[PDB]
Design a protein around this ligand. Structure first.
Ligand code: ACV
Ligand code: FE
Length: 328
């Protein structure tokens, strides 16, 4: 198995006012998006030093009682409103991974989308503060920290596609973004349940099968344990780990609106018997956000594809991923 070209791109110019420097970042994003589809954003300004420890301590300190109390609808029929946000329980002997997902902290009972019961909008559930001191504060701060990084990255993608730098970020707003964070724990298990291991067509043992991200872009931090693979025409290639950079790639919404110029890479997770943490931030727009498709491969830039409302796209994408790759 070969290794994917995943360049490290210094994205710090995307926070500044040096427009030519931003174009040089955009060029690198373009090249990476046209190659394997991945790059590492470095010099990003986020303090990732304790992210994995906090994630690990939370999952290892939360009790079965608390897990049920926070569980999403898939694990607790009492919580019919929790489709996205809440705890995703492991099933010992069957399912190793466990996780906790939260949404826009601004989704409160006062929010008109909560008032209207619009799909994909939910009020976050949180554990008891005294049992997990500082956890909710850390989590909400992280949401906005990575929101800021993602907003700059979207300026890079816009410039890379020949657009004004706010072409994407104008739709990415704190008051309505459907973006999510997931704090995922992959445990070390001895013995590891074979039932939790899937075998790929090529014989690779996997924890999670091939998929395309449901997002505009995905902004991912992982602990330093190699696991991800990207599919190329020559087969699946290992994505090396990087314990300070953020792994970036385009989701299927970007593939749609660019007429497949920036494809959504097919990715999978190799099975590794190791304690590790995976923290994706899914850059989602607002429920009614619509981006008009274009084709950067055409002189007139014209695409015949339908503009897609992002909320309906997200609703369809998340259900499809569950149906295909199972409930996480
Ligand atoms: C890096 C990825 C492969 C990561 N997995 C993931 O990101 C997984 C599987 S593709 N993502 C999802 O299932 C979509 C989560 C959407 C979230 N609940 C929401 O409501 O917005 C991992 O480490 O497992
Ligand atoms: Fe993915």
């Amino acid at each position: 198995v070969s290794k994917a070209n995943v360049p490290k791109i210094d994205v710090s110019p995307l926070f500044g006012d040096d427009q030519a420097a931003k174009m040089r970042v955009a060029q690198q994003i373009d090249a990476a998006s046209r190659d394997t589809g991945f790059f590492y954003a470095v010099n990003h300004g986020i303090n990732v030093q304790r992210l994995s420890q906090k994630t690990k301590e939370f999952h290892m300190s939360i009790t079965p009682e608390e897990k049920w109390d926070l569980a999403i609808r898939a694990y607790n029929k009492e919580h019919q409103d929790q489709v996205r946000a809440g705890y995703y329980l492991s099933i010992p002997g069957k399912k190793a991974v466990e996780s906790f997902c939260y949404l826009n902290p601004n989704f409160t009972p006062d929010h008109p989308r909560i008032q209207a019961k619009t799909p994909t909008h939910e009020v976050n559930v949180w554990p008891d503060e005294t049992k997990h001191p500082g956890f909710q504060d850390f989590a909400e701060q992280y949401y906005w920290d990575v929101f800021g990084l993602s907003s700059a990255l979207l300026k890079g993608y816009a410039l890379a596609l020949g657009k004004e730098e706010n072409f994407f970020a104008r739709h990415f707003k704190p008051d309505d973004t459907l973006a999510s964070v997931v704090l995922i724990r992959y445990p070390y298990l001895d013995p590891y349940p074979e039932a939790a291991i899937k075998t790929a067509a090529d014989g690779t043992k996997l924890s999670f099968e091939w998929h395309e991200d449901v997002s505009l872009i995905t902004v991912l931090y992982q602990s330093n344990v190699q696991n991800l693979q990207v599919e190329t025409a020559a087969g699946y290639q290992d994505i090396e780990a990087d314990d300070t950079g953020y792994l970036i790639n385009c989701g299927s919404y970007m593939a749609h609106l660019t007429n497949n110029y920036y494809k959504a890479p097919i990715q999978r997770v190799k099975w590794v018997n190791a304690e590790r943490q995976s923290l994706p931030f899914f850059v989602n727009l607002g429920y009614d956000s619509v981006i008009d498709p274009f084709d950067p491969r055409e002189p007139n830039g014209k695409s015949d594809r339908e503009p897609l409302s992002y909320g309906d796209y997200l609703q369809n994408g998340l259900v499809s991923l569950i149906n295909k790759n199972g409930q996480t």
